[model samples]
Target: EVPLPQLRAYTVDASWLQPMAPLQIADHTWQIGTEDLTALLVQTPDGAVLLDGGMPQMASHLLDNMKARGVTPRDLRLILLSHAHADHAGPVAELKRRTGAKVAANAESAVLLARGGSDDLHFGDGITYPPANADRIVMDGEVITVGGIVFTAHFMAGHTPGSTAWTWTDTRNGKPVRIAYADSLSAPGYQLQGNPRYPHLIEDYRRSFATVRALPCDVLLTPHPGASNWDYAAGARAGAKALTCKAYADAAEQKFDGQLAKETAG
Candidate 1:
């Protein structure tokens, strides 16, 4: 087992065009900018796992941030990608090349990464695609472990055909068992009502919604803040309410499907 890297939290203000709040959800988890992207740097007794390597421009900064927190590229064991959007998987190949880390993603997301393409080309306008080639293709209900933390992957296809959400139990403030939802929902202000046009597969979205709701999430950490109802500043209480499976289901049925479309349309 290699020595695990130390982690420290820092906030980056990425409010260039919109007010975005990105938080380091855990010692090894970072929510990057307004893209609502979630990146996890898992340090285990063996090595490390880098999840969703942020955008191309943000890669260097991410690496620097990791270094500042005591991680080095050589310590990386694997790189797990959530999807293949430029913002989510853009830096993957490069990071892998630099670190010799094994890369894994959903089959569809792997395709996108292999082809050097993006699934978010028509994101704001409704249409989306899945990634192309993943070294290790992840399936629904698969469990990935790093640092003794088990992350169970759930296939939530509404965001994209290969969109995946990972649920893991963690000790909050070193206390109780709490589940963490990573990038299961989109950006903030994306309601299900108005303009953005509901995704083509409403049923899948609903199913995904229900799946997340069934978890034991005591701390709800959004890939991007303000997307869900939970307020991070309010601590576990706010997180408990905001991260309810019901709230996620409602966001999928109403907010993302109905309200977001209406708001964006106007």
Candidate 2:
């Protein structure tokens, strides 16, 4: 992961309160978002692939992001979930019905989702929504191919028990392009108290930190672009966007450690 200078640090503009315009990362890859949550769209010979779905309320806005990029719900043939969190996978069920896209998620996610967990996504806010299940349940380093595009799922846990980061390579103007659909690597505010609903909670996050640090993220994209600067960091190069794997991992460790410290203090 090659870090870039002047990576776009997201500023809370008025648009941050609303959906921002789609940022084209490559010829075949682009990102769109609601006021807060964002999703990545990748086009392949087989069909379009949507990385994550925004909030249930923002499903329409999510659709709007697609249309702006010259895509439609019908173009989506695959919906890959990075996690089962409410904001990230919120509209999966609705989108599945709307686009008829086959859903895929890691096994860890399936466990939490198949049986809804308060300790999972929605935290204290609520998983008022229902448990979301995917069509294909994959494992770490599993390869998913659609058309000619290849995506390898990197299952990690921290933000959620099933947190994931997807990796793939495409060409932009005859040059190779690699991308990482970084799940919300932001530190959780919750104190890990065994989270009875989500066993092995603290350990899950630890394993994820080590795994993501070694990922090849030519273009590092997150679920919440509003809280990141790597998108702008991506602009430095024309062939591939910049990578923030190191920076992100370091920050995560700092946050995770603080969280552990707090929980142990009590």
Candidate 3:
């Protein structure tokens, strides 16, 4: 039997957009996105399922990556989003149109997706993208099964009101490994203390952290690769083998606590 292809390490261009060749992460699973973002593609007997779409500007780039991996537009059955951030869910609408795939997101994300990242509690109108409506609203702890691939949506809702962490099992070496596509837990530029727009910001983040910490995550994947200390160019396999979801959530919780302390101190 021929050996399967392994994921390649590529450096991000100065422009922060480096098109990567479709690299296999596991059986029928590939990462088809730019160097800066991850758009995971999983192929099943039924069709393909895409996790997140990179930025709006990277729309065609994502398509190119998919095609390079032998996935046609129509072959994609669903597009699942982690959140409504422009850098993450930016190209959702365009990809959905091209692939004719059903897009599913948590209810809060659906609202922001329709607004194209507008009126954000923290970002306000600073970040925007082509608005797209979700075909389905995934409730917390909802299980989405497509083409024999099962994904459980865990609504974490901290970084964004709709932030979601998803889990799915992929068989490696005849044993199943649980992969957690964890949502971003950092506040970045948000007001962590006494926020008027999102009164529950602190509480939301606290609960979100706890939710991720308790996930049955054998492989930790983050919307922002750096969040999980995943250096793709160095060696994706190294990170994939070394990282875990518990530590990822623990670090985020610590960061959140420090940020809140700073805000309260001021």
Candidate 4:
């Protein structure tokens, strides 16, 4: 069987923190995170919107990448979160303070953000980070518009109670491209049988699997670069392939089922 990069356990790899050159993915979107972690930049006429903060201590890298794209901190108007995991939401606090961007997250993730990573259903206090607050509590299926860019939030609760996916459109070569920044579905090191903290983990994950598979994705992006077979050098245009979201969800579902069966047998 081929190895599944999406199911890799919760340890932070050294490669995930290294800086990467910002590459334009669409007419208005750019990939601006590290080699492994993914942070997106959406430049709109009004200002810029950043999606997801990479691993802790990587704020400077994110800021620098934005600057490299000719975007200043003050030009950033909104910060969006996929989930509150330290590796994804770690730089939010500092970025918010530096850029004065309004932070927006689904209601479920908003609570998690306020607590940082403490008492987390999966990582607990071991993966804690600096706490931040959400300026807008977006509801499921709601669309958040900034400048001319509109992102539709889809609450995919499983990896975390607040794990969310975002969908939007941008043009490339005079053609419309549907992009989906789907959240992680892998249950890395999770207790699937009867997770006390996340009792509905399995159900939520199954529902999320179908949801992700149903997304209109011409381009699929994940919190982790490897999760969607995304290549930083290739960027989104070259990186996006047919059924990337389906393939990712398919692998995730397979891993999840295997994990659940193993736990049940145990």
Model 2: residues >4 Å from true position, as ranges?
1-17, 114-125, 193-195, 231-243
Q: For every model in order, what is the number of clashing pairs?
A: 28, 3, 0, 0
What are the RMSD figures for all models against the true structure?
Answer: 10.4, 9.1, 9.5, 6.1
lDDT of 3 by residue, 48-141 (tens): 8999987787789888877777778988889998899888888998988888688888889999999999898887877788999999988999
Q: Pick the candidate with the highest lDDT.
A: 4
Deviating ranges (above 4 Å) for candidate 4:
1-11, 234-243
lDDT of 3 at 69: 72
How far does residue 34 in candidate 3 sit from its true spot (Å)? 1.4
Off by over 4 Å in 3: 1-15, 235-242
RMSD in Å for model 4: 6.1
lDDT of each: 0.58, 0.71, 0.82, 0.87
Model 1 misses residue 175 by how many Å? Answer: 2.6
- Residue 266 lDDT, candidate 3, scale 0-100: 74
1-266 per-residue lDDT for model 1 (tens digits): 99886643223345311212334555445443233344566655666777676555556655765665466888777777665666566677667666657776777666657666633423442222223345687888888887777777777765555677667665546665555554555533434332244555556666777776776666555544355565444433434455455566566566556644666577
- How many Å off is the CA of 87 in candidate 3? 0.1
lDDT of 4 at 256: 89
